[PDB]
Design an enzyme around this catalytic site. Structure first.
Site, PDB file in Angstrom:
ATOM      1  CG  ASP A  32       7.485  -7.532  -8.320  1.00 43.38           C
ATOM      2  OD1 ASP A  32       7.633  -6.468  -7.957  1.00 43.38           O
ATOM      3  OD2 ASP A  32       6.480  -8.024  -8.558  1.00 43.38           O
ATOM      4  CB  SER A  48       5.208  -4.067  -1.582  1.00 45.35           C
ATOM      5  OG  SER A  48       5.449  -2.543  -1.723  1.00 45.35           O
ATOM      6  CG  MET A  49       3.918   0.022   3.145  1.00 46.25           C
ATOM      7  SD  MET A  49       5.790   0.548   4.010  1.00 46.25           S
ATOM      8  CE  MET A  49       6.023   1.746   2.886  1.00 46.25           C
ATOM      9  CG  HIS A  64       7.959  -4.048  -5.369  1.00 45.99           C
ATOM     10  ND1 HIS A  64       6.900  -4.652  -6.026  1.00 45.99           N
ATOM     11  CD2 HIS A  64       7.714  -3.274  -4.374  1.00 45.99           C
ATOM     12  CE1 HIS A  64       5.736  -3.931  -5.268  1.00 45.99           C
ATOM     13  NE2 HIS A  64       6.095  -2.999  -4.629  1.00 45.99           N
ATOM     14  N   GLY A  87       0.898  -1.216  -0.016  1.00 48.88           N
ATOM     15  CA  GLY A  87       0.120  -0.089   0.002  1.00 48.88           C
ATOM     16  C   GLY A  87       0.894   1.253  -0.074  1.00 48.88           C
TER      17      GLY A  87
HETATM   18  C1  LIG Z   1       8.245  -0.168  -1.869  1.00 52.39           C
HETATM   19  C2  LIG Z   1       7.304  -0.413  -1.066  1.00 52.39           C
HETATM   20  C3  LIG Z   1       7.704   0.057   0.711  1.00 52.39           C
HETATM   21  C4  LIG Z   1       6.022   0.490  -1.227  1.00 52.39           C
HETATM   22  C5  LIG Z   1       4.820   0.401  -2.430  1.00 52.39           C
HETATM   23  N1  LIG Z   1       4.096   1.689  -2.473  1.00 52.39           N
HETATM   24  C6  LIG Z   1       4.525   2.486  -3.536  1.00 52.39           C
HETATM   25  O1  LIG Z   1       5.206   1.992  -4.273  1.00 52.39           O
HETATM   26  C7  LIG Z   1       3.997   4.018  -3.532  1.00 52.39           C
HETATM   27  C8  LIG Z   1       3.503   5.123  -2.667  1.00 52.39           C
HETATM   28  C9  LIG Z   1       4.378   6.402  -3.194  1.00 52.39           C
HETATM   29  C10 LIG Z   1       5.467   6.972  -2.997  1.00 52.39           C
HETATM   30  N2  LIG Z   1       5.789   7.787  -3.842  1.00 52.39           N
HETATM   31  C11 LIG Z   1       4.663   8.065  -4.561  1.00 52.39           C
HETATM   32  C12 LIG Z   1       4.599   9.081  -5.574  1.00 52.39           C
HETATM   33  C13 LIG Z   1       3.431   9.183  -6.381  1.00 52.39           C
HETATM   34  C14 LIG Z   1       2.340   7.957  -6.142  1.00 52.39           C
HETATM   35  C15 LIG Z   1       2.513   6.996  -5.278  1.00 52.39           C
HETATM   36  C16 LIG Z   1       3.619   7.085  -4.317  1.00 52.39           C
HETATM   37  N3  LIG Z   1       2.543   4.116  -4.257  1.00 52.39           N
HETATM   38  C17 LIG Z   1       1.712   2.993  -4.623  1.00 52.39           C
HETATM   39  O2  LIG Z   1       2.010   1.973  -4.322  1.00 52.39           O
HETATM   40  C18 LIG Z   1       0.366   3.890  -5.188  1.00 52.39           C
HETATM   41  C19 LIG Z   1       0.519   4.536  -6.298  1.00 52.39           C
HETATM   42  C20 LIG Z   1      -0.745   5.243  -6.788  1.00 52.39           C
HETATM   43 CL1  LIG Z   1      -0.440   6.176  -8.239  1.00 52.39          CL
HETATM   44  C21 LIG Z   1      -1.839   5.548  -5.881  1.00 52.39           C
HETATM   45  C22 LIG Z   1      -1.705   4.553  -4.810  1.00 52.39           C
HETATM   46  C23 LIG Z   1      -0.753   3.909  -4.256  1.00 52.39           C
HETATM   47 CL2  LIG Z   1      -0.681   2.901  -2.851  1.00 52.39          CL
HETATM   48  B1  LIG Z   1       4.094  -0.961  -2.219  1.00 52.39           B
HETATM   49  O3  LIG Z   1       3.634  -1.486  -3.680  1.00 52.39           O
HETATM   50  O4  LIG Z   1       3.487  -1.413  -1.211  1.00 52.39           O
END
Ligand SMILES: CC(C)C[C@H](NC(=O)[C@H](Cc1c[nH]c2ccccc12)NC(=O)c1cc(Cl)ccc1Cl)B(O)O
Ligand SMILES: CC(C)C[C@H](NC(=O)[C@H](Cc1c[nH]c2ccccc12)NC(=O)c1cc(Cl)ccc1Cl)B(O)O
Ligand SMILES: CC(C)C[C@H](NC(=O)[C@H](Cc1c[nH]c2ccccc12)NC(=O)c1cc(Cl)ccc1Cl)B(O)O
Ligand SMILES: CC(C)C[C@H](NC(=O)[C@H](Cc1c[nH]c2ccccc12)NC(=O)c1cc(Cl)ccc1Cl)B(O)O
Ligand SMILES: CC(C)C[C@H](NC(=O)[C@H](Cc1c[nH]c2ccccc12)NC(=O)c1cc(Cl)ccc1Cl)B(O)O
Ligand SMILES: CC(C)C[C@H](NC(=O)[C@H](Cc1c[nH]c2ccccc12)NC(=O)c1cc(Cl)ccc1Cl)B(O)O
Ligand SMILES: CC(C)C[C@H](NC(=O)[C@H](Cc1c[nH]c2ccccc12)NC(=O)c1cc(Cl)ccc1Cl)B(O)O
Ligand SMILES: CC(C)C[C@H](NC(=O)[C@H](Cc1c[nH]c2ccccc12)NC(=O)c1cc(Cl)ccc1Cl)B(O)O
Ligand SMILES: CC(C)C[C@H](NC(=O)[C@H](Cc1c[nH]c2ccccc12)NC(=O)c1cc(Cl)ccc1Cl)B(O)O
Lengths: 177, 177, 177, 177, 177, 177, 177, 177, 177
Positions: free
Chosen positions: B154, B80-81, B105, B51
């Site tokens: 991944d 991931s998170m 990842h 997330g």
């Molecule tokens: C590496 C790991 C620890 C985290 C991963 N989460 C992420 O990589 C990122 C969160 C983020 C950080 N900086 C950003 C800049 C622009 C947009 C999103 C982001 N974002 C998403 O996953 C995502 C993206 C969108 Cl567009 C909407 C909703 C979400 Cl929740 B994972 O997969 O758990």
């Protein structure tokens, strides 16, 4: 209420697709019942078309892990992940009702993106299949190659054939609760 | 109820994507438990595909902030998170069940607008990636450069591999609650 | 419950976009807690990507108006109207957790209709921007001219950078609840 | 609960568009608080972008009808019908918080069908405009012609300008509940 | 082709709703035929459910303006704007087939926005109705108040009743082309 | 091409639902073939499920008006307005192929709006039905009252039943073109 | 064909909204006719509810640029950009048919984004309105401040009023092509 | 036809967004005209809100590559890539009509995916911006640093301002084709 | 027409995504130009973002198969399969215009279904990737390992860098057709 009252009798109903929500609820009820009493059996009813592999493994590992024997009882249908959890009940205490159905088949998934992303996804789902084959093999008394062959496509089994397969131990007959 | 009942045993169930709503719920439960008892351990089960980074960090910093040790227990999958928070448990008290999977990842995001807005968004997510890599290096013992290479795509880990990677301390064996 | 039991501890959770519904809820809790006890501090946790300016001002003016000091604690992210409310806590009681992000930028809006209507909407959002800049100048000690330049585009700040900017007073360290 | 608790302190929270459902709730709460005690003041907080003219009038006339004084307190934004209800509070007890916004403008509507149907709808909303101007005139001390001119397009007022205009009596200062 | 062939015989077919595209095409064909020969009659067949008032007036004024007599022949149905253009053919040369139908009714429209915009819309459609009533009155030999009363709602006329009304001059009988 | 090449044989193909566009095409082809030769027969093939009453009357009255006999030949199906136009051909020259179907039923419509609008629409469609009954009565030799009863619901006739009814004159036999 | 035949007589039909495609078509036709004959007048019929300002200006400047006089003839309606182009015909050669309507009003548009982007869009559309007012003042003889007031809302004019306004030179009377 | 007949006069119309299809058409026409005559000028009219950078560069490089001088004439609006191609015509032969508008701004884009993909997209669009700034510098005589600041947001220019900027050489004035 | 007339100069314009329809068109044009004359060069202009691998291979192999040299000229952008066809031109006759863009990257795909289907799709696209690397290696003189590493993510190249890389032979300079 109505499930809450059956919970008092150490009965858990698994009656839907297995996703992350359903896995957490089932695991939580297993944890709770053990916290209430770590010796008495638990009764897990399974009527499920299957679901997510990792959600299934949350349930499987929690069954293996707690101290109570978890009895498994198939009513209606246990397919895919459902038949995997059916086979996961305590050996000697896995049941099906006489007209319940069991289906086994190999896992399914998806993959999109660059060739190197597709290959990571492929490898991961192949490794997951070998792990599932190996564990189901040990749960049933079958060879790994038999599991691989019998799950290449959908494989429907009657209660009696599931017992001969090793997925369950007894077909449950009436006149008893 | 059923999670309300597990809460009396100081157990929190994290069983879904981590969005802002999930994070406030987990954070509130962490605060609630410390408020009832600031010394007894808390038990955080994680079954999560990941997330939002900032929602993850609300959970992470709250775990580090409160007096109680937070045990992390991976059931099913921490991706991931999810695996960042798994790594975040009190050292010596980060567990995975034997068939749980862990995945790491790099972060994902999106940017649209003018060249300068896209540059601002690129710079923010690279800096976010350096912050995540640095904290995971501290929590695992891996160097930053190895985290960087290992999260390029991944990277699926079994429980035992998560242990050797430093993301958890022990693979949980059965016969014990 | 869970927020209800945290309410008893004078803790208010702001963990979503700020619209009229959210603002009405936060004003009510603030009003409620003052009625219960007009001397004891209130603790406002902030994890918000922002929201409506007028709904934010409803929270802002309510925070300044009541007798209790309102501590602001940023967990995860305080962006846009979120960071404005973070800066609005009682001075010396504005915090961020070590990995929380803070972001400031100018207001956004839209206008459609006759040339006369577009002019009215433009004039209004410009005056609103000057009002926000003036109040943020007062809360941080930065000049209005510097806030104007620093909010021209999205400006992401670490917890430490938010402290040096004046948005918060301290970064909150662990080992204390 | 949280609004039910604040209703016991004779507080009503108007924090949304004013439609028929919202008007019924506000009217009911006013009727209820009078029933409990016909002498003590009532506190109506207003954060509303406006809404239906007839819904607004159900609230307006109930305010004028009941025995208790009804104090109006503008937090955030009183626009359109919102600002009309702001002016409707007992004279001397109409407030705004320092950064609240007040907006006045003429009514809007729509009509479709035969020419004679369109004429009927136009005459009805013109008559409605004259009714609203005449009431805002009695409430503020401005002339009808001035209201007419000042509402031809959206007219945004600071809290201080709304005081100078006659919509409110005092800007509310802090260090008091 | 097939209309282009009939065009060579000075026949134009108006067989659809009257919008700006259709009006432009009919007007272009009228202009063309006059350019070809300014003295021979033109034959306008009308089978139309109506359409836009201004598109209709483009056709009407072009009929009145050019030198050739424009005969109008109703087949099937001429309603609303269609019966207006039917009545606009050269007096003595307006026809209907025996089973064709004619309908007259007042104009329809819509209006949205501020009270003052709705009033401009209403005033304009009322002035347009008076202009239509006046012109149809002179085309039929009826009083203006008769046109107003008979178009208040939909008013269906047989060919014979259209002739007695003044909308057409003769019901066309067979065995002639 | 290929219809254009049947046109030079004085053959028109009516093979679809009858709306205003189709009526326009058929009428134009009728006008055009009379222009080429006012004496020779026209041949109108009919395979139609019906359609608009006013569009149908545009074709009907044009068939009646022109000098040439118009032969009508039912292939496949002439239902509703299609069978009306089958009965409209020159008496003695109305045909069906042996396996063609003919269907008659009463008109269908709709209406919404005020009671007096619904009454206007009801009166108009009842009057249209009496007009259709009377013309079919003249075309077939059946009494109006018998048409009224036989069209109350869908009434499917064979080619032989349509000839006995009076809708056609002869069932067309092979061995001729 | 049919517009291609009219183009042989140096006639252009502008019968729709003015978008970029329409404007390029009109501009190309203007250039085509000048290329065939730079001395003979061009005839531009206008039936248009308006359209884009910049597409209108492509037509406008091309009309002013070529050697031939362009006569403008309003049939049906010239609204918004349609009446700007009507006014743009060669002086003494701007006409309306007797029941044509003309409408003038201020430009409309839309803006979303940051405060500074909305300011840029507000400034551009006010400056565009000053440019349109200034040119209409030059073409009509009205002062700029009268144009400003008269186009505040929709302002509908008859042919004779458009003549008195200076938008056209003559109302066209019949009996002349 | 109509563009075809203008083509014989070496006139190309660019009157829409610039995508690959539009660019392919304009390159083809340029290639075609050079093949017909490598010495005579080409006339490229521009009324475009912009479009794709790479499609624009396909047109730009083709203009510089062929032997014939390519005159650029802005009618209506040349914004974004439209104004880049306007500045690309043979020096001394770049024109605007007096009321045409010109707009310059920085490039826009979008990026989605992993952090390292976002970085790649950002680096790409920044390099693209520098390439465009460098070329516009050469075409206009302005410095790169001044183009950088003047395109930070939308910059609308009159024909006269475009001449002083260096985007065009002359404002085209009437009584000459 | 305009592409048909350029085809008589042995020019083919590839200016879109490469799908099966586009490949059939290009292949046919190549087949036809060889039929007309098997010795004169062919000129293939390429402005393509890429597309299907098998569609591209239909074009690639036809280029290699026919007698004539096929010169490739990149205008605008040759991405993905676009840059592959660019390198496919006859060696010494592969060009790019000075500002054209070249991009290389690995293939993308998707797979869904049973684990064995996902494995089959992954192996097929991996094999496709090795085939493409092997061909690009022969076309450029780079090693397969370098191609492999340089296409792991999107790799943008200026025309000059594409010359240094071996995708093209020369950057095209002006003063020549
Ligand atoms: C590496 C790991 C620890 C985290 C991963 N989460 C992420 O990589 C990122 C969160 C983020 C950080 N900086 C950003 C800049 C622009 C947009 C999103 C982001 N974002 C998403 O996953 C995502 C993206 C969108 Cl567009 C909407 C909703 C979400 Cl929740 B994972 O997969 O758990
Ligand atoms: C063989 C049996 C014991 C399990 C079956 N479950 C599965 O096969 C797999 C789960 C899985 C494992 N590795 C994957 C890689 C990519 C995607 C999914 C997966 N997935 C689904 O069913 C599925 C697939 C999608 Cl895309 C979305 C939601 C679900 Cl829930 B069954 O039918 O119960
Ligand atoms: C700078 C910071 C402290 C505030 C930011 N909020 C805003 O900038 C403004 C609110 C606003 C002020 N004046 C306006 C005039 C017209 C419309 C909206 C507005 N608006 C939105 O965000 C928005 C915009 C639309 Cl169209 C719909 C819903 C919302 Cl909620 B942030 O991002 O928290
Ligand atoms: C001036 C101020 C004190 C009130 C404003 N409200 C209004 O102007 C009017 C209500 C009204 C009065 N007479 C009408 C005739 C036809 C239609 C609507 C109306 N209408 C709306 O707001 C509206 C309009 C539609 Cl179509 C649908 C839903 C709503 Cl809720 B404001 O903005 O609060
Ligand atoms: C009485 C008869 C001779 C004319 C009838 N035409 C009309 O009544 C009027 C046209 C009109 C005049 N003043 C208006 C003000 C606002 C809107 C429309 C109008 N409008 C429509 O029909 C209509 C309406 C809309 Cl909203 C869209 C498309 C159309 Cl075409 B008929 O039925 O032929
Ligand atoms: C008996 C036979 C010879 C005619 C049948 N046609 C009809 O009955 C009538 C046409 C009609 C007459 N008066 C009306 C009043 C209101 C609406 C429609 C009508 N209408 C339809 O069929 C229909 C109905 C709608 Cl709502 C829309 C489109 C069409 Cl085309 B048949 O089936 O061929
Ligand atoms: C006064 C009269 C002579 C012109 C009128 N045209 C206009 O007023 C303006 C054009 C315009 C100028 N500056 C703008 C800034 C933002 C958007 C649009 C514009 N725009 C529209 O009408 C419109 C608006 C949108 Cl969002 C999309 C498509 C169109 Cl075409 B009329 O009614 O003919
Ligand atoms: C400054 C001026 C001379 C050019 C402007 N064009 C642009 O800025 C750029 C083209 C571009 C360059 N590098 C990119 C990287 C990713 C995506 C697009 C691009 N893109 C668009 O316009 C656009 C964007 C999307 Cl997402 C889809 C369709 C289009 Cl066409 B203007 O407005 O004419
Ligand atoms: C590396 C470069 C030289 C080619 C790139 N083309 C590709 O990478 C591949 C084509 C392909 C090869 N093997 C596959 C297996 C499954 C699916 C697609 C493919 N596919 C697409 O582009 C694509 C993919 C989908 Cl799902 C639908 C439509 C298309 Cl057209 B590029 O970007 O030009």
């Amino acid at each position: 209420d109505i499930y809450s009252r059956l919970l008092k009798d150490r009965i858990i109903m698994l009656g839907s697709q297995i996703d992350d929500n359903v896995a957490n609820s089932i695991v939580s009820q297993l944890l709770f019942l053990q916290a209430q009493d770590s010796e008495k059996d638990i009764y897990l009813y399974i009527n499920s078309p299957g679901g997510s592999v990792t959600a299934g493994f949350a349930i499987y590992d929690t069954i293996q892990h707690i101290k109570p024997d978890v009895q498994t009882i198939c009513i209606g249908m246990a397919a895919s992940m459902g038949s995997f959890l059916l086979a996961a009940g305590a050996k000697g205490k896995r049941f099906a009702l006489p007209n319940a159905e069991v289906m086994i088949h190999q896992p399914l998934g998806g993959a999109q993106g660059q060739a190197t992303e597709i290959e990571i996804a492929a490898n991961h789902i192949l490794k997951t299949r070998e792990k599932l084959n190996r564990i189901l093999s040990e749960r049933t008394g079958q060879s790994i190659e038999k599991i691989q062959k019998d799950t290449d496509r959908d494989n429907f089994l009657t209660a009696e054939e599931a017992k001969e397969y090793g997925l369950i131990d007894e077909v449950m007959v009436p006149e008893t609760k």
